[PDB]
Assembly symmetry: C3
Homo-oligomer: 225 residues x 3
Amino acid sequence: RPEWIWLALGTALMGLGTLYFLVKGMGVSDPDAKKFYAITTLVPAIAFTMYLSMLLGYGLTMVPFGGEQNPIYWARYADWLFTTPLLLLDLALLVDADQGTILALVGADGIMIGTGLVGALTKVYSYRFVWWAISTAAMLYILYVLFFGFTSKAESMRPEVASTFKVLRNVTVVLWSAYPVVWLIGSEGAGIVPLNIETLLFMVLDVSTKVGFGLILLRSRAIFG
Amino acid sequence: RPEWIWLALGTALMGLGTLYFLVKGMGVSDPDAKKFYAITTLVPAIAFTMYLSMLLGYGLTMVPFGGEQNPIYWARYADWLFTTPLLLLDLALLVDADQGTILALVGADGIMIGTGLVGALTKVYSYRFVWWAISTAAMLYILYVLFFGFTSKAESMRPEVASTFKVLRNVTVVLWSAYPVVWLIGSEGAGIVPLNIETLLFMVLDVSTKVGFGLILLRSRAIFG
Amino acid sequence: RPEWIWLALGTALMGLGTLYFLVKGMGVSDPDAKKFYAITTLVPAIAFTMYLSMLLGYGLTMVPFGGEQNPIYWARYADWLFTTPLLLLDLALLVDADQGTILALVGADGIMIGTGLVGALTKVYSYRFVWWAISTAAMLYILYVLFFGFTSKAESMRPEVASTFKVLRNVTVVLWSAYPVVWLIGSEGAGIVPLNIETLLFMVLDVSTKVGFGLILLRSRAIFG
Ligand SMILES: CC(C)CCCCCCC[C@@H](C)CCC[C@@H](C)CCO[C@H](CO)COCC[C@@H](C)CCC[C@H](C)CCC[C@@H](C)CCCC(C)C
Ligand SMILES: CC(C)CCCCCCC[C@@H](C)CCC[C@@H](C)CCO[C@H](CO)COCC[C@@H](C)CCC[C@H](C)CCC[C@@H](C)CCCC(C)C
Ligand SMILES: *C/C=C(C)/C=C/C=C(C)/C=C/C1=C(C)CCCC1(C)C
Ligand SMILES: *C/C=C(C)/C=C/C=C(C)/C=C/C1=C(C)CCCC1(C)C
Ligand SMILES: *C/C=C(C)/C=C/C=C(C)/C=C/C1=C(C)CCCC1(C)C
């Protein structure tokens, strides 16, 4: 299958991302730095396994909608289900967010992937978009809290915290919101962009939001207590 | 389908419930009130999505048992899986429960929905009831802790706490135990009550245990620190 | 089916395990002893439900690999998914492990069962072993942290803690690593050992790692604060 190379290239990059983070994580014995290193290595590990599941073709399935037999990488939702809230925890711990606010976001994130998955496998075409919309909605809630609520409390901590957060926020804020767009125009939605392009688009995005995101966070001197 | 209206009416009520709670939650910046507001809005959000999934027919499936092809809304279990422990957490935080007790209840709740679901999709008629029984059993465990162990510690806190808890306990204690009953006589079990009635019965129950429940809790002056 | 008796025997042992733990747990009102009792009872309850689901034949499924139709107790992965991380929590709470480290382990455990399941239901034979290997790899990570990281901080606490831990570690360290071996040689992998034997092998293992493990822990005077 044409996108095979993109799934390979992502399996690889996620692999190396995990291993790098795993080694870079050796000899870190601060409770706070641990937490971070822990979460930030899980994302690409989980990501790695799902990229491989897609590469080997275990993450793939045939959903009928549109009078056609459309291909749907369901693995992506299995992956995101776990990676995406972890990624949020990273941000939340950093700014020192309320037990409350975290539960809020994870809840929202859950629903977001939750509905997105439902969407992806729905057999009535127009219906899929109702799911998209609901998910897209949950996203706007995350992006809100991240942008408004978080930047407030982010700005009332150490110089290194606020800075690192701000970059990490920005990256997420931008790249995260690219996913629904891709979804919509892609084979899950309109079928405007072809699968091989969609996969590549997603593949670049994932690598960035995870390894890229991770590289920034774990490199910073801001993960410490 | 006859119950379509009940699923609509519940989608709606859960929708509004979520939105009411979402707005009512704006401008609440106490760490404790947040926690509550967060949990109590997830419930109806999750509930909203699952009611919609049933309405659109994504939460529905055909399970054969009894030499028939019986309609099972599986989405209910996907819903309850998450909503029900959250609801417990609400009660648990209110009384200031031990880290232990909470894990106890969530585990029990898990098993209750867990087996419930297993029961619901079991193809051997008599077998379903074994599952019912096991689930019904875990329920009696929660209702216990709630009634005995919780009311103890509930009673050794502020006046507003004990009061609010007591109502909330009562509401849960009564309406929660109605679910198995309905399950049993309904199309999951005996098939005495018809699906459309079952759905309405369930719909009324859900709206109460969630929005109803929530309305009470979020209105009280007892969610604060 | 030949192994029916083994699943029965396990259902039974897990049942009694649960009930014993449930009774023995009455009248324990220390926050730390609660936590432990809570987790250690969940394992066998969860275990009980999945051994029944396997006995009743709800946990079973036909996976095609090797040009044959192989039988795969998928329930095992449903069980382990939850039992195995709880088992680790028990160990981690005991030694007083970092929020970080726990999250680390649970993560690894998730991936372990995560991939194991993927493996079990994979339709390409050689493929199954790639999953095994990845899973087996996560295991080595858990066994490491348990053996190296944990024994360090374990040895810097009370005499009773270090001792009990050391036993519990050892039991886990040995018995846990038997599972992959069994998997490989069994009907999931090579199909060297027969299912009825595999089941018996697993059956003994589960009972030991759960009830046995639990009997040791809950009997000890080290679960207290
Ligand atoms: C707050 C609100 C409630 C928000 C909820 C959003 C609900 C919207 C539901 C969409 C619904 C009106 C149906 C859209 C399909 C539309 C193309 C026409 C219906 O069927 C077509 C035949 O006419 C199928 O064409 C197949 C041929 C293809 C070439 C497809 C047409 C090309 C279009 C560019 C893609 C259109 C489909 C979706 C992107 C529509 C909604 C997108 C929007 C939410 C960004
Ligand atoms: C501590 C214990 C281990 C736990 C106990 C769990 C085991 C219970 C399993 C019962 C099992 C032997 C099956 C019972 C069915 C029995 C009435 C036979 C009639 O079955 C009918 C035809 O064969 C099925 O159609 C159905 C047609 C119906 C419309 C007929 C009406 C009569 C009844 C209402 C049939 C339904 C049976 C259930 C109500 C079972 C009782 C539940 C009870 C535990 C509250
Ligand atoms: C590592 C993967 C990450 C960080 C993925 C993030 C994914 C999203 C934010 C996906 C969002 C979606 C919507 C908002 C609309 C519906 C389609 C989805 C699931 C692609
Ligand atoms: C918002 C939904 C709530 C609070 C649902 C609560 C549901 C239950 C307590 C269901 C219980 C069941 C049993 C105890 C017996 C078996 C059947 C079930 C799953 C309906
Ligand atoms: C109560 C059950 C317990 C403690 C189970 C532990 C199970 C494992 C450690 C299973 C491990 C596996 C691998 C490491 C390789 C692939 C096959 C598995 C899933 C059997």
